[PDB]
Design a protein around this ligand. Structure first.
Ligand SMILES: *C(=O)c1ccccc1OP(=O)(O)OCC1CCCCC1
Length: 106
């Protein structure tokens, strides 16, 4: 299901997510979800941002999944699925560097 998602890159490193997201063609909010390098059972949402200060850059947010079922970056805002979390952050920037816009091209 999660593996079925085109934005789910699975087991790729933080550096690789950065290589992919640092493409000059990527607008703010370009993103992907991957496994956390060191936190078992956790995912990482990698997102491109851009400003005149830093230019094109990348941020990483940890996504936790409870056995109790919920998915979240902040425990205050949980979802019944990773798909629903992605859909929510595609509408709300909240504390992220930018709302999610486009799936990172390979
Ligand atoms: C996502 O998993 C994440 C969130 C914030 C900052 C960095 C990451 O990417 P990661 O795969 O390097 O970090 C998750 C792992 C490795 C680094 C320390 C935290 C656990």
């Amino acid at each position: 299901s999660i593996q079925a998602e085109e934005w789910y890159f699975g087991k790729i490193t933080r550096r690789e997510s950065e290589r992919l997201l640092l493409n000059a063609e990527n607008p703010r909010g370009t993103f992907l979800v991957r496994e956390s390098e060191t936190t078992k059972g956790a995912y990482c949402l990698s997102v491109s941002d851009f400003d005149n200060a830093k230019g094109l850059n990348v941020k990483h947010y940890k996504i936790r999944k409870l056995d109790s079922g919920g998915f979240y970056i902040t425990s205050r805002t949980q979802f019944n699925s990773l798909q629903q979390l992605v859909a929510y952050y595609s509408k709300h920037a909240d504390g992220l560097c930018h709302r999610l816009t486009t799936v990172c091209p390979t």
